[PDB]
Design a protein that fits this description.
The structure is a homotetramer. In chain A, the strands form two sheets. A nine-stranded mixed beta sheet of chain A has the order 3-4-5-2-1-6-7-9-8, sandwiched between helices. In chain A, strands 10, 11, 12, 13, 14, 15, 16 and 17 form an eight-stranded mixed beta sheet that branches. Chain A is globular. Chain A has six helices and 17 strands. Chain A folds into two domains: about 160 residues, Rossmann fold (3-Layer(aba) Sandwich), CATH 3.40.50; about 170 residues, Dihydrodipicolinate Reductase, domain 2, CATH 3.30.360. By secondary structure, chain A is α/β, with parallel strands linked by helices. Chains A and B meet through strand 10, strand 12, strand 13, strand 16 and strand 17 of A and strand 9, strand 11, strand 12, strand 15 and strand 16 of B. The structure holds nicotinamide-adenine-dinucleotide (4 copies). One nicotinamide-adenine-dinucleotide sits at the interface of chains A and D.
Chain lengths: ~325, ~325, ~325, ~325
């Protein structure tokens, strides 16, 4: 049940994709990587990680490859995906991690370069969009290009699904307090057209737009147009948290909300539970897409009116990557 | 009244003096009580990690600070009752230690010779003032009053404007808030509070606040209608409060923003921006709260509507401007 | 039939990491008691959740008077004064003194009054027997009762200094360590005893800081006694630090010759590592060495006969130092 | 020459304009070249994460900024040779991009119709000026010159003082330096430089710098006598330079301190402190360097002696004060 994989964009997500596949001893063989740099620099960045520490396997490079745990992985440096020589090592499924091919029409260039399927590590417009253990049963053997949405969608979606299923969500808004990422800036300076993105990320609370709630109907069709939200980007290197304020279809207590969620996390490798008073560094390295936090649940009620606040943590790097890999393994088998 | 003692010469305490002198007030700080030496209080007054060098000359002797040429006595009584407020003639005590946060406790200050107490924190069930929301509840008989928390001074003007314009029926707040001294630098015990034990500059840390819970003291019609909490994050000062409300009227973002723009007009306490600011831009603000029209969001499904409004606050210096606005008035009664 | 029962006094950053490392290495040493100033509940929470190293790798539960760690019960006491700790209840023999409040022989001998047999102090503690493992642990003997492992900084500096002095001679030197902030500092600007600089917000400043690592190096390397001075610059990283030594040596060297001597001193040495990779401080986090010499930073400045040599070593001032503490403890326990 | 253009409207570029306005310079900034829209440049000028709100008005058009009411043309030419400096008559270009740090490269601004270039960084073997150390060497016929680095502006006045008083025979420097835009926010490729590829706000990152090696361009008698390097650390601005020297005379610390105190007297570029300051206290400094008497250390064994001296610098605003001093003189020759 092998399938050969190529990684396009060996960055925070792309490097963690290899990390995780070796960690779970996946049957997937990673045979090629495409980025914009030398094998040398990619070896350095794979070996040493500011968030997750030394790579658990050996790493070397040659003039045109990485040698990871004694296995050779070709390195290419093609700016445009249609020029990547994917057939040279039979890379059949591309894990598209650059941020620059987030649509069907743009990821087509990997199929034109000779791959069979593309799994995109970000929202990619109206395409099949999977949160593993929420809607992965919609994957079938005709799918060629799919998205796993954002970290934030993988955090939000299981909480939202559980609340919808148990109580119905009539309307809600989300705020995620999110670690800073590579889309931001180190010192104040231009960052494309987003003004807030131009600002020094480790020195500010920065409001930030995200489509996690807005496009939740790709993942949970029943909640199409029922959710909005945004992010506040904050100075932590990884580890994030998602609050959702909802009007539910039934009146509830906090205990009742927590039981329902506990039930949804039972035998669920994607969605965990805590009643410990954890903080974001405690989620770093999580193997869940989302961890519901029963300690932060809140019911505000006056007469026939009730607001329900529910909160879940996520490691927007490694946690999300575990979800991406669950999805890759199923997408490779169909 | 024109003479002030400060108890607790901390982040708040020191900025009080700074603000008074900034506005050339005719209130004079004549005495300070804390736990340390005038050497160390001078060092900290002069050198501030958040606001840079003090704008006036500072010096010290063994029992005093010398600030812009004027002498301020320094005491170090553990217990407020021992403070000789009488010596230098201190009429009003700005209480900033965090340790006398009630009517009974701040009484010690009157016992030690001062007429009135303004507490820099929530302080139970007393007159609790957000200037430019409910400062006209203050009368000449009042002796001991609160200015609530930073978060209170952020939330109350926003809630006031929305409630007057539209009605708030119910809401929940989250403030994404700068770490403060009640937290820990490294992981280790901080009384009984598990989350306050964790390294503050390396974590997003959920935290209890009763700014929403106790909003009734400031806006009596909203009693029991709001709840909320904080997420404490690694910025040294500058914070932001989000309120999700159910309003008594359907609204657009543009309507919400114009009602707020209007409430902020010629309003010393409560400002407005439609610029794409971030937390560092609020550092040194002269408002208690700055409504950010860029973050307004209306989520509507039929007859159901969630309204998210967002306002920034310098939880240090912004809040202090309010404390000093209230102090200026309280000293005239 | 060697000493096998430990008590930890001060279950803090160092104290909790002592237990962690003992379990990691499958030590035959059993931690039977902990003394701190708090409830089992809070110590359990802190042990389970660590901002720097992540989730405890073993099970953690607690009762009203104990912790249960990997299924093994550990008594918890809360005695502010060491002389009242009831060490004899579970038979604690060696105390790992990690509070910071008992940094002398006079102070720490209170644990002996309290029923323990020996004390190992996780910090410099005046002129008592002071051990950097794999530098001068051969000086430790059966009669040693109270001993120090000096600081994180001493455990970083000493093996570099030892190699250099052995190979070339150190005539004189000055150290600066760029060091993670620690609990002795302040979160926000406010009083912190009488040290002015320690009053300043640690995660928002570069803060000069006095350390005796160099001053007191003679305790560990007798021939360098009074030959070194130094200080620290505390900076906003949570853990991971680096020590620079600038020396006048007794011989003209090249950078290559200094690197090869250092390489050789780090061979078959579990305490002292070597690197020639372009690493940064987060890469030293969780290191099992007390010191890692970095050949990339070596620098020889020479004008005629005047020569200055700068050598640089990383250290994880929490975990890496803890590994050294544990190496010394294991030895201590069997003398 | 009164008319200036800025290439690279970055941290240095923007603070150049801010400082010129602050000292009410007679220099007229007429044009700015960068890579982006006047809208984005306006936003960045208005709101500064390190120094707060811009003290003057800022607006924009599709091709200009309006700053304090004055129009500044905005161009977006990634090759300096195509920047149309002749349009508004920009004569002196303040070259702040990092991409033209050599005579051969900056020559392009002259080809593009300017008369002089002042580079905000080391630029090899050309006239390199640390103001109040070697500005006397600036010559009427110089058309391309350097102000070296931040670090060079810190080190040079301290080295000069020590060398003139005691003779510096050999020495080595380490600067513990705030992170800059040459580093990375998250771990990722940053050219060929491996350490620049690492998350700057989460690491101590050793970094090469020529400030010591190139010192001869500023203090010729010290050519080849110094070496050094930096450690980049998680502060947003404000840095400190340590120098360890063998001097030509035995000294005490008071002696070194006194000598340095004397060098700083009446010196707009080179300050002195004997207060226990930390890095945030240097932010917004108007000196190129502030010598710190509190950190001086003399280590002596027999006849050998090592002297450690230490100076703070605001690598952004402090350095820029030097750039401006140099610019004002350069404009008048
Ligand atoms: N928190 C997170 O970081 C996170 C979470 C979920 C999803 N994502 C998404 O995953 C994707 C990558 O995020 P990241 O944080 O890893 O970003 P990143 O900047 O760390 O990595 C991107 C990598 O792609 C390379 N690259 C850029 N353009 C390229 C091109 N044309 N061809 C080949 N390589 C190219 C870069 O050199 C870099 O190595 C983005 O879509 C992002 O939205 C990120
Ligand atoms: N920092 C904020 O964001 C903020 C905002 C609004 C309100 N407040 C409130 O203002 C008060 C002070 O907060 P802070 O951040 O200034 O705290 P802080 O810890 O900075 O300062 C407290 C000062 O009081 C001193 N102190 C402690 N116990 C004392 C006693 N018994 N007698 C005299 N001095 C004593 C300390 O030495 C210190 O200088 C608190 O009640 C807090 O809730 C803080
Ligand atoms: N980088 C480091 O953190 C480092 C490295 C080397 C050595 N050290 C040394 O190790 C010791 C501990 O450092 P730490 O960083 O773990 O400090 P910490 O403040 O994290 O831990 C101190 C612990 O001891 C407790 N404590 C304080 N006084 C007490 C008493 N009288 N009785 C019982 N418990 C008490 C505290 O509650 C806390 O749990 C200090 O001597 C320090 O110098 C620290
Ligand atoms: N601490 C410091 O930041 C510091 C101190 C002293 C000297 N310097 C030096 O000054 C120079 C600028 O540093 P900075 O920190 O301002 O950098 P920065 O990256 O903040 O600014 C660079 C600016 O130049 C622009 N730019 C890039 N390439 C360009 C091009 N080809 N044409 C036009 N504009 C371009 C960018 O968009 C940006 O606005 C560098 O040479 C640096 O070494 C920096």
């Amino acid at each position: 049940s092998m399938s050969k994989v190529g990684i396009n964009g060996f960055g925070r997500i792309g490097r963690l994709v290899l990390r995780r596949l070796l960690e779970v001893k996946s049957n997937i063989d990673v045979v090629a990587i495409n980025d914009l740099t030398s094998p040398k620099i990619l070896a350095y960045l794979l070996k040493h990680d500011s968030n997750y520490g030394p790579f658990p396997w050996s790493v070397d490079f040659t003039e045109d490859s990485l040698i990871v745990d004694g296995k050779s992985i070709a390195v290419y440096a093609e700016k445009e995906a249609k020029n990547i020589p994917w057939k040279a090592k039979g890379a059949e499924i591309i894990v598209e991690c650059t941020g620059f091919y987030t649509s069907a029409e743009k990821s087509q260039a990997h199929l034109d370069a000779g791959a069979k399927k593309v799994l995109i590590s970000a929202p990619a417009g109206e395409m099949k969009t999977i949160v593993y253990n929420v809607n992965d049963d919609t994957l079938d053997g005709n799918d060629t290009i799919v998205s796993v949405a954002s970290c934030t969608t993988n955090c939000l979606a299981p909480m939202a699904k559980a609340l919808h299923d148990s109580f119905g969500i009539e309307v809600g808004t989300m705020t995620t307090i999110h670690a800073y990422t590579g889309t931001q800036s180190l010192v104040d300076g231009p960052r494309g057209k987003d003004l807030r993105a131009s600002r020094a990320a480790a020195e500010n609370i920065i409001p930030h737009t995200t489509g996690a709630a807005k496009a939740i109907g790709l993942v949970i069709p029943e909640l199409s147009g029922k959710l909005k939200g945004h992010a506040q980007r904050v100075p932590v290197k990884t580890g994030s948290v998602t609050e959702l304020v909802s009007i539910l279809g039934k009146k509830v207590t906090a205990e009742e909300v927590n039981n329902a969620l506990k039930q949804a996390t039972t035998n669920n490798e994607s969605f965990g539970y805590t009643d410990e008073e954890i903080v974001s560094s405690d989620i770093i390295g999580s193997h869940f897409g989302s961890v519901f936090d029963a300690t932060q649940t809140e019911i505000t009620a006056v007469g026939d009116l009730q607001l329900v606040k529910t909160v879940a943590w996520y490691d927007n790097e490694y946690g999300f990557v575990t979800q991406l890999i669950r999805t890759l393994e199923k997408f490779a088998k169909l």
